[PDB]
């Protein structure tokens, strides 16, 4: 057995929607990772003949926790052997009603500002900004449509809409986000409009911190582009500089700017992310009065994506074989191995085969896996 | 007969307003009686600035209230030090960090807040960054006009409402009679006296539990830092919502490890719904703390580093010695508070490049008489010791 055609990690879909999956496998001639093969739920999914496991569009008191939010597999299995795919996380989500916000922020003349759109945490995996734009409906931009980072304003690819040098005028205008869920085609306009409000500098202020934790962490994906805050206020207008830590010790090294790496105004942008780019930065924020700092972790996740070699071969008893896990993905917590569906006693990339008798014959399986997403890959030993 | 020692250091921090002005004492004794210098941010040493700063024959640093127009940055945002000084040596104060503030309106504002029913809700309210450590919460209050947290100086735990010693509105259990309601929070200024009510008002918008869902954090942020002085009150949030309702466990690294204890709740360490209080705070509560948030559905965890700061303090063993020229002398500096982040050591008003709590100078020559002082700093704070080598 062998899958062209594997399911994702991820499989969601609203209560109105539904959805299919399907597996292909292929050779000469489902389950669960609880361990078993449980047959049809009536009305709440169906397997059919032709191979797809298909939730259909359900009413949500028909919502069953134990069936529209679980892990699934996909076994194909044939006369020599047996394979599993890669976990299959399905969520069923209710459609349900929820409002975004733009609320007020308070910024110090000639200082950089950041309007966000607030979203309900429970539904901010499914609602992303799509855009902001102007009391009467005109855009600041669009989010992730091309670009530009020496405008006035700015859109970052995180959501929030960036302000350079608030001056008066951009206290006269209202702020609103359009979000779009992305189960749905579903965009709405947020609930309201936020304003700035801005101080005239008086005396002498030294950096201050939207909020006094002075670190934070985030995640990020490759061939993606990451935003890492920095968000201070001060009079005179403060400079920014980033650096970021040598992994493994506390020193640090300017972080090179050039048109990969970006910066606008305090913020970092790093654009087409990398795994390396993954470490600790510090934004650190200076004016004549003084200065202060602050640390952002952040992880560069890469997909998982695993092949095993040499993955077909011929050998008899008292011979050697072998076969190393080719694995590429971020970031890696575990290794797991796995002969004909069944987990054997043994986590590494190099497994020791010595004396083989033929109860040792099938197919074979290397497994990698974090906390989000799992790889999987096959192969076969012929004797 | 003697050097300097000071009688009365000037405190670490002074901030005041453009109306009241400042005074600042710095009283140094010895024999003979030391003269007193007062110094800027640069190192430059101070007088007079007529209408603005101000040194009398008693060595005192005042500073009188001010026209907005006649603010100066290198006068009224500085760190000043004292400096003593007669024909035995020098010493030199604390950082003694002089803000003043010119009298300005601010807002506060309480954002809404969106939760699922039957979890707990936290409403913040929102003070400028800029105007920050000048702005506390007093109380709260709600549509009909009724004021939460005005009562008592420690808050009860068990009920509905509660106000948390950090300032925000604890609700417990909510449920869709709560959306109903609407509050604002009332912020004193420190410096000006002056109190008002946020200029907007927040409520709670209750989503009704249809499916389930796994337990989500305001922030995707899986790490945070908080800042919290001991013998005060500090609340450690987590804020989670998830259905069904999640349960909240929180515990502590043990240090220098990967692993971890389980917080201990009693009569001083209480949990209030996802919320861990320590009271009465002591240097030893410093560290890392996990809070990890379980339902059916799934789970997850967020790390806050917790910092119990103590007010720094320092002596130099001994405080005098006498020494024979050829022969070792030692000076020990003994410290407390928290976090002290350098030790650095002076003579005479010079900087030495001597970074450890002990300091022996192997063979004392003549030019070794003199004032030694130790200096212990961390980012809020400073604090030196003096002591005197004589010569044989
Ligand atoms: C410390 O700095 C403060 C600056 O914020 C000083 O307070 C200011 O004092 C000046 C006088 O030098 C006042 O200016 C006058 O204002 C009135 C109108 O007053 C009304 O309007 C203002 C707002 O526009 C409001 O603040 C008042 O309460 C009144 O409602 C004019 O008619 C005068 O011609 C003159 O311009 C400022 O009003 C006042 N500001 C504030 C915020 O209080 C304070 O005096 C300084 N301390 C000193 C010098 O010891
Ligand atoms: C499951 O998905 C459906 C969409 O296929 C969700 O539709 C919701 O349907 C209800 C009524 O069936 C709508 O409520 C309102 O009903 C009154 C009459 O009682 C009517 O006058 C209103 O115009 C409105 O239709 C609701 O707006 C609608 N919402 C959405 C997002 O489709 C349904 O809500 C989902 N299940 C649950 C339990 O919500
Ligand atoms: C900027 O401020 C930081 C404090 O966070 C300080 O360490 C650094 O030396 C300052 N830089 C300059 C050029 O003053
Ligand atoms: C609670 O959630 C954490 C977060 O990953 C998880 O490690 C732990 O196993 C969960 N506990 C239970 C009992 O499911
Ligand atoms: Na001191
Ligand atoms: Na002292």
């Known amino acids: 057995p062998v899958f062209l055609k594997e399911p994702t990690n991820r499989i ?15 050779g000469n001639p489902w389950i669960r990772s609880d361990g078993t093969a449980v047959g049809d739920v009536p009305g709440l999914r169906q397997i059919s ?35 599993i795919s890669r976990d299959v996380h399905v969520r069923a989500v209710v459609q349900q009603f929820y409002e975004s916000e733009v609320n007020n922020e308070y910024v110090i003349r000639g200082n950089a500002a950041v309007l966000k759109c607030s979203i309900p945490s429970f539904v901010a995996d499914f609602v992303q900004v799509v855009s902001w734009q102007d009391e009467e409906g005109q855009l600041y931009g669009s989010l992730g449509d091309q670009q530009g980072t020496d405008g006035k304003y700015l859109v970052l690819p995180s959501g929030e809409l960036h302000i350079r040098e608030v001056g008066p005028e951009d206290g006269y205008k209202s702020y609103q986000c359009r979000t779009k869920h992305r ?34 962490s985030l995640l990020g994906s490759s061939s993606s582009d990451i935003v890492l805050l920095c968000q201070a206020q001060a009079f005179p207008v403060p400079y920014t500089r980033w650096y970021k830590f040598i992994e493994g010790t506390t020193r640090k090294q300017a972080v090179v700017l050039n048109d990969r790496v970006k910066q606008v105004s305090g913020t970092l942008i790093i654009k087409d992310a990398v795994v390396e780019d993954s470490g600790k930065y510090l934004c650190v924020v200076n004016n004549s009065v003084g ?21 077909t071969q011929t ?13 590429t ?21 190099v497994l020791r085969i010595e004396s083989v008798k033929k109860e040792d014959k099938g197919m074979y399986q290397c497994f990698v896996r974090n906390d989000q997403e799992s790889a999987e890959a096959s192969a076969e030993l012929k004797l």
């Open 49 to 83: 003949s032709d191979g797809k496991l298909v939730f259909p569009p359900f009413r949500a008191e028909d919502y069953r926790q134990e069936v529209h939010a679980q892990v699934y597999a996909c076994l194909a299995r044939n006369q020599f052997g047996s394979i």
């Open 291 to 311: 200065g202060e700092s602050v640390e952002t972790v952040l992880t560069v996740t890469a997909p998982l994506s695993a092949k095993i070699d040499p993955p």
């Open 183 to 216: 189960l749905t085609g579903e965009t709405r306009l947020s609930a309201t409009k936020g304003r700035l409000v801005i101080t005239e500098p008086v005396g002498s202020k030294a950096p201050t911190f939207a909020t006094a934790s002075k670190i934070s």
């Open 329 to 349: 993905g971020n970031p890696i917590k575990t290794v797991s191995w796995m002969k004909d569906g069944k987990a054997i006693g043994h986590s590494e990339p």
């Open 315 to 327: 050998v008899d008893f008292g011979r050697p074989a072998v076969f190393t896990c080719q694995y």
């Open 12 to 26: 969601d879909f609203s209560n109105s929607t539904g959805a299919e999956i399907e597996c292909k496998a292929s």
